[PDB]
């Protein structure tokens, strides 16, 4: 259905077995995204901290 894919498509062994990939145009890795750690509400008895 398409002649070429130009996208953030990761070079993987299972894909390379059925399609061709150029050498990498971008280096990367899996990472963790978290919601930021906002400031906590001061707890009762936080005067002992």
């Amino acid at each position: 259905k398409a002649d070429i894919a130009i996208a953030p498509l990761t070079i993987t062994l299972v894909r390379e077995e059925v399609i061709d990939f150029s050498k990498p145009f971008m280096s990367l890795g899996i990472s963790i995204m978290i919601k930021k750690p906002q400031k906590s509400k001061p707890g009762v008895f936080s005067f002992l901290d």
Binding site: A2, D3, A5
Partner: peptide, 29 residues
């Protein structure tokens, strides 16, 4: 003749231009 490129709407690699409805073909992205 014209190469059909498959791609994905994934920011910031490919995004719809703010005025894409007024543009044609490759100029929409």
């Amino acid at each position: 003749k014209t190469v059909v490129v498959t791609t994905i709407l994934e920011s910031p690699y490919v995004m719809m231009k703010k005025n894409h409805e007024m543009l044609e073909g490759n100029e929409r992205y």
